[PDB]
Design a protein around this ligand. Structure first.
Ligand SMILES: Nc1ncnc2c1ncn2[C@@H]1O[C@H](COP(=O)(O)OP(=O)(O)O)[C@@H](O)[C@H]1O
Ligand SMILES: Nc1ncnc2c1ncn2[C@@H]1O[C@H](COP(=O)(O)OP(=O)(O)O)[C@@H](O)[C@H]1O
Ligand SMILES: O=C(O)CCCc1ccccc1
Ligand SMILES: O=C(O)CCCc1ccccc1
Ligand SMILES: [K+]
Ligand SMILES: [K+]
Ligand SMILES: [Mg+2]
Ligand SMILES: [Mg+2]
Lengths: 312, 312
């Protein structure tokens, strides 16, 4: 039993013997090295000047190491194997946890050099999303060893969009109060009672990115009245095709002169790395959804996150 | 006074004082470093795996050296400067004389690795033609120091297509007799008496390449009667727009299965490097002409070289 992801499946299975764990493990063992190989080919095809960057080189090496360890691992025959594969997966997850940051820093300068601006976008888009895919499958396998209720692996059986939004609201508010002394309140409307099966992992990246953006913009446009700023309003629309989360702020909007730039990696007006929007959009599209911006210059911004529903 | 080349001009000038030599020299001094820089940017943007190839790296270094020496050279103020610049130009010409071969060998293997097949074509096309441009301008400057009659620099004032074809016929025949014991005869028809101003340099590359192809094909398809093979027939058409040289052989033609490949760098059915056709076409197009093939599978091949006339 499965839940389709692009070109991949999140194994849904329940054998008491623990058989499903072996099927999963063998799947990963079949799937991971291939995808890592594609990422290594991506590094090999980078413009020479960029690929030679020490940080890019470092990540490049990590990916080779990862491929080495994965391929060196013996075919899984029993729980004892699988149990040990999990140790490797965990080590890999941890070794690669800073990869986005390293890529950002590695490319920040090196990218100025080449003529082809969209080449880096293509590379980052492809790399970050393949990576998300890899870490999802990996994390899902590990999660099958857990006995969390309302979870089949990383899949929440009854996810509440409101609850997960509130989780990331509290988080983003704190960051914001720390830097500004206050934070916009956030109201949530629409299908606030919706519950459905869903993988929270993408939400856990995207939502805090969008919230940080909205809060920062609200504060930086109300520097005279930090004690009194307009709410951020979030609207949940749940239908049979997709989930829509609209995040509306009164933070003055995105300027016409920045509009063409904000979806570029490394672009920022400063929370300062410039990856939030491009990464979030790439993630959404990778999962079959989208991320769209509506700027009302001089008033604020509406951001629309759409994510497809799990088939089944 | 000038003769236009793409984005560049072949200085036509005649001062007795030797003033025109300074204008030329200063032009080169202005023009060469820029074009070398573009080629260096081309090397920097090569796929990392290819750019790391030791031979590619070597050529890459040559180009940097070339840029260093050119930029380090002091602005030209007098004949004594110019005279010394010429020494540098000559050294560069000679240091870079094997560059095409080095690139061919450097890429032969490295190119298999990347996904994008047309990326190397674009690189070679751009590099080889920029290089041709550079060596033409350079050689032209040096040639302005000569007192050859019917030559203004590298420009023959009264070039005879028949004479230059015959030059390369004798050359290609010898190569061919050496390898096979005989060589097709060659007949030349059409405007055999034409004479007009023209830069022979491109002809000196293209013609021997096309002739070698035609002769090899004729022999390899007449292995039973090497002592008696069908002529190669060359037709000259001279009009006001362009010069057309048609090289028809009865060498059995280019097979349908090879047709899509023959214009690819490194493709060969063996005179064995696989650069003749792609280089020749790139050269022709760079100069505003073209190179077109008509295959009659089972009979032979017609090759059409078109080169624009010098405006003025
Ligand atoms: N809700 C918003 N309101 C106003 N401006 C925004 C909003 N979201 C993003 N921006 C602008 O787009 C830029 C890119 O955002 P992002 O990709 O998250 O990078 P960062 O937040 O690190 O600057 C921000 O620097 C900011 O100028
Ligand atoms: N006149 C011709 N007749 C038949 N085949 C030809 C002719 N010219 C070229 N070819 C084919 O096209 C291929 C590519 O030619 P070229 O680029 O000159 O490389 P090379 O001669 O080094 O093989 C040759 O290997 C040969 O198969
Ligand atoms: O996270 C990344 O940067 C890419 C994936 C590293 C990894 C491989 C296999 C399993 C788990 C993690
Ligand atoms: O020939 C090449 O490979 C490229 C040109 C080297 C050169 C530079 C300046 C002048 C003369 C020659
Ligand atoms: K950005
Ligand atoms: K070829
Ligand atoms: Mg941000
Ligand atoms: Mg040839």
């Amino acid at each position: 039993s499965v839940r389709l992801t692009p070109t991949m499946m999140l194994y849904s299975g329940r054998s008491q013997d623990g058989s499903h764990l072996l099927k999963s493990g063998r799947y990963l063992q079949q799937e991971l090295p291939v995808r890592i190989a594609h990422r290594i080919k991506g590094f090999r095809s980078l413009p020479f000047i960029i690929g030679c960057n020490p940080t890019i080189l470092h990540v490049h090496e990590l990916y080779i190491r990862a491929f080495q360890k994965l391929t060196d691992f013996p075919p899984i025959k029993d729980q004892a194997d699988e149990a040990q594969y999990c140790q490797l997966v965990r080590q890999l997850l941890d070794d690669h946890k800073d990869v986005v940051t390293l890529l950002a820093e590695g490319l920040r300068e090196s990218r100025k050099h080449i003529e082809d601006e969209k080449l880096v976008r293509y590379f980052l888009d492809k790399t970050l999303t393949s990576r998300l895919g890899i870490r999802m499958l990996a994390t899902h396998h590990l999660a099958l060893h857990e006995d969390k209720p309302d979870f089949v692996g990383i899949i929440c059986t009854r996810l509440s969009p409101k609850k997960i939004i509130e989780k990331w609201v509290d988080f983003a508010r704190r960051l914001c109060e720390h830097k500004y002394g206050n934070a916009p309140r956030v109201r949530i409307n629409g299908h606030v009672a919706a519950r459905f099966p869903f993988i929270p992992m993408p939400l856990d990246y995207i939502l805090p990115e969008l919230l940080k953006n909205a809060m920062r913009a609200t504060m930086e446009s109300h520097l005279d009245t930090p004690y009194n700023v307009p709410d951020v309003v979030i609207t949940i629309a749940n239908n049979d095709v997709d989930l829509i989360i609209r995040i509306s702020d009164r933070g003055g909007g995105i300027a016409h002169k920045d509009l063409d730039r904000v979806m570029d990696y490394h672009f920022t007006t400063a929370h300062g790395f410039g990856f939030g929007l491009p990464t979030s959009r790439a993630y959404a599209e990778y999962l079959g959804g989208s991320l769209q911006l509506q700027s009302l210059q001089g008033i604020g911004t509406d951001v629309y996150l759409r994510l497809r529903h799990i088939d089944g």
